[PDB]
Amino acid sequence: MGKCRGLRTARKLRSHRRDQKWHDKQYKKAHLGTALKANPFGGASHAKGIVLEKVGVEAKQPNSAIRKCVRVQLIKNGKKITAFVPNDGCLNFIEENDEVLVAGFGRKGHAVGDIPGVRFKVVKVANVSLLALYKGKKERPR
Amino acid sequence: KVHGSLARVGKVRGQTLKVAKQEKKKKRTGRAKRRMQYNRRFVNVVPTFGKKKGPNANS
Amino acid sequence: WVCRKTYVTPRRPFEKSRLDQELKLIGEYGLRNKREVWRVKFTLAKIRKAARELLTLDEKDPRRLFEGNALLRRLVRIGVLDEGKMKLDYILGLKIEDFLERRLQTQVFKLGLAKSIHHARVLIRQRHIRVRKQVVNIPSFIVRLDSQKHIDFSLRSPYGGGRPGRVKRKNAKKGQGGAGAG
Amino acid sequence: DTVTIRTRKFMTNRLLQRKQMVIDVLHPGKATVPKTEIQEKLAKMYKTTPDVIFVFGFRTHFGGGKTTGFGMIYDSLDYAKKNEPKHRLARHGLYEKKKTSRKQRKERKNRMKKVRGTAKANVGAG
RNA sequence: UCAGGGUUCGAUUCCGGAGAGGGAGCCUGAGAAACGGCUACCACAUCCAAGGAAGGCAGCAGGCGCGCAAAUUACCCACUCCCGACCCGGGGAGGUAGUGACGAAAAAUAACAAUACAGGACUCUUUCGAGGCCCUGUAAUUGGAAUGAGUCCACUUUAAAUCCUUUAACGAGGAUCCAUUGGAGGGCAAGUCUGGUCGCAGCAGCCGCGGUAAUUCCAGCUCCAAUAGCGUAUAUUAAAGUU
């Protein structure tokens, strides 16, 4: 309680709630829209780009590994993202200065696992999925 | 060895044994797949004292 | 134009206790899939939702009388409920198994020739039974109470009168053209 | 095979000069007999001869053993020939309409817009 | 979507409104500030003998471009209605087919005996042991029976046809007329089996696995879940009495 409970206090309630909703964390990203503007995506699930150069990222402690990322610039916003390559040895199935299709990690703007600075992964290298390259259901077209 | 192109991919898949042993069998589907699942778990009659043994085990 | 989704999924994805009940229920009636179970259980919970309305509102209001009467009539017409009951409270005493009993494949087995429940489903689909005069391929019929004594084989089919199948009629010609002289 | 034509919804339609009913058929052999065969039998059930019988419909129920259609019986030929949908007269021939169709018509029209005072010229051009 | 109270979404088949590249003006008519009418500017773009002339797909198809992202330059006025001087003409409105795992409904991928082992109620017997019944899988073959999937004459369907339903003749022995998608340390239903790798390579929404005996990696085997579907990304609700 600690609040008015008149029968004519609809205004003082409905204007108060509309204000104290802005302090909520979820709401403040959704409704200012600065989230979208800042994102390298337009708010689309995927996006398409062109590879710039392979890189390797050294994982945050205590784990030690090299995580074989790429760096890609996008078509639809012309700006750059550092993107993970999943499975094993799929670095080889990516070849520089071609198109790729990117996709978010699965934690909505926040780095996943022990790798820092990488919020994206890669799905298609030339209309052929990393899954099908790895399994052998399709082959890289050269 | 920790080393041996330890800055580069392929080191646990390109140097394993290659196995391609497989069976020939016809597995059941739909109705019959549930029929075997029902009988094999619950009615044979199943019970044996103090059993705890799971549906798999290497015991 | 108009569509709806009949089944619903379980709230929890895994729970040994729940899974065992769904398994043993499928074993009993020889059902194909768990989607064929949740479908039934939707029907029950639907009827239970409608019922829970009518119990709150005084008797001798027109909504409660007319609805209840015609609801209970339908429950009696399929015979999952007695007329020695027929009160709205006894709607809530209904449960899953009574529905599944009224299914065609259950009634084929119960009142006609089969060797197991697994046999009976195959007979319905391979068109060797009828319901009064009419072939069916649906073992999920639900069978009105009056009609549980008109389940018969098909009037043309190898079971009952009608032409011999192509396993028989092959082998009959195997005594004259399959091994008769060539 | 076994052919049973059974009479249902008898109406004497004086305004169109016909008699319209339902054509209820039972046949446990091969269900669905030719429509030609049906109108022979119905001709000799009201004695009106098969040049004023018209039938259509004939969807066969699941499991066979029954088929149901819809049939008319006209008093005279000229009353049928006048009333009758065009395709139903051409169904068992005594009528036709030549149709080119529907691209030859439009392409002629659009060419005709360009000329004036002569309608026959564009048609002559082939 | 949801117990009650709510929250989010509504470009999109009904109804109302606004607009035909952007602006402005206007003729005709009962009705228009009309654009498959006209006149001008501005922005575009085409033909030309260079003197001039002509244009507006947010109509149906189709193409380019844009992007994560979206179908046939098909048939036809038979239905439904509309328009006309009119029973008779016309209508990419509209109806029909094609492409179509958006999504929804239906439910095939083997059912039954023989032998073979196996279990337990039951009976006889002092126990031992035997008989015998109910069912189970599981091997070996089989045996008889059944059916559409397909192929396919015929009827039927309809504007004409397809499909469907209806019907000949062919059409099943498990090897083929082949079910996959994910996972098996905990959350959370399922292996401390074997080989390889040995903080390397990789896995891991989260907690964490990997440094020579890896229940988590790479494979095989086995098992579990869901099942003609299942996984992944993002928006959004419930979970949130964390508005």
Curated annotation (Swiss-Prot), chain A:
It comes from the Eukaryota. Hydroxylation at Pro-62 affects translation termination efficiency. There is a cross-link at K37 (Glycyl lysine isopeptide (Lys-Gly) (interchain with G-Cter in SUMO2)). One of its GO terms (molecular function) is structural constituent of ribosome. PROSITE patterns: RIBOSOMAL_S12. Keywords: Acetylation, Cytoplasm, Endoplasmic reticulum, Hydroxylation, Isopeptide bond, Nucleus, Ribonucleoprotein, Ribosomal protein, Ubl conjugation. The modification N6-succinyllysine is found at K54. Residues 1-20 have a biased composition (Basic residues). Transmembrane segments: none annotated. Its main location: cytoplasm. The modification 3-hydroxyproline is found at P62. The modification N6-acetyllysine is found at K135. One of its GO terms (cellular component) is small ribosomal subunit. It is found in: Cytoplasm, Cytosol; Cytoplasm; Rough endoplasmic reticulum; Nucleus, Nucleolus. GO terms for biological process: translation. Residues 1-26 are annotated as: Disordered. Component of the ribosome, a large ribonucleoprotein complex responsible for the synthesis of proteins in the cell. The small ribosomal subunit (SSU) binds messenger RNAs (mRNAs) and translates the encoded message by selecting cognate aminoacyl-transfer RNA (tRNA) molecules. The large subunit (LSU) contains the ribosomal catalytic site termed the peptidyl transferase center (PTC), which catalyzes the formation of peptide bonds, thereby polymerizing the amino acids delivered by tRNAs into a polypeptide chain. Belongs to the universal ribosomal protein uS12 family. NCBIfam families: PRK04211.1 (NF003254), uS12_E_A (TIGR00982). Component of the 40S small ribosomal subunit. Part of the small subunit (SSU) processome, composed of more than 70 proteins and the RNA chaperone small nucleolar RNA (snoRNA) U3. This is Small ribosomal subunit protein uS12. It comes from Oryctolagus cuniculus. The lineage of its organism: Eukaryota, Metazoa, Chordata, Craniata, Vertebrata. The gene is RPS23.
Swiss-Prot record, chain B:
It comes from the Eukaryota. It is found in: Cytoplasm; Nucleus. The modification N6-succinyllysine is found at K51. Component of the 40S subunit of the ribosome. Contributes to the assembly and function of 40S ribosomal subunits. Component of the 40S subunit of the ribosome. This is Small ribosomal subunit protein eS30. The lineage of its organism: Eukaryota, Metazoa, Chordata, Craniata, Vertebrata. The chain holds residues 75 to 133 of 133 of the full protein.
From Swiss-Prot, chain C:
Keywords: Acetylation, Cytoplasm, Isopeptide bond, Nucleus, Phosphoprotein, Ribonucleoprotein, Ribosomal protein, RNA-binding, rRNA-binding, Ubl conjugation. GO terms for cellular component: cytosolic ribosome; cytosolic small ribosomal subunit; nucleolus. GO terms for molecular function: rRNA binding; structural constituent of ribosome. GO terms for biological process: ribosomal small subunit biogenesis; translation. It is found in: Cytoplasm; Nucleus, Nucleolus. The keyword Metal-binding does not apply. Residues 156-182 are annotated as: Disordered. The modification Phosphoserine is found at S147, S157. There is a cross-link at K87, K133 (Glycyl lysine isopeptide (Lys-Gly) (interchain with G-Cter in SUMO2)). It holds the Pfam family Ribosomal_S4. The modification N6-acetyllysine is found at K60, K110, K149. Residues 102-176 form the S4 RNA-binding domain. SUPFAM superfamilies: Alpha-L RNA-binding motif. It comes from the Eukaryota. The keyword RNA-binding applies. Its main location: cytoplasm. Component of the small ribosomal subunit. The ribosome is a large ribonucleoprotein complex responsible for the synthesis of proteins in the cell. Part of the small subunit (SSU) processome, first precursor of the small eukaryotic ribosomal subunit. During the assembly of the SSU processome in the nucleolus, many ribosome biogenesis factors, an RNA chaperone and ribosomal proteins associate with the nascent pre-rRNA and work in concert to generate RNA folding, modifications, rearrangements and cleavage as well as targeted degradation of pre-ribosomal RNA by the RNA exosome. Component of the small ribosomal subunit. Identified in a IGF2BP1-dependent mRNP granule complex containing untranslated mRNAs. Part of the small subunit (SSU) processome, composed of more than 70 proteins and the RNA chaperone small nucleolar RNA (snoRNA) U3. Belongs to the universal ribosomal protein uS4 family. This is Small ribosomal subunit protein uS4. The gene is RPS9.
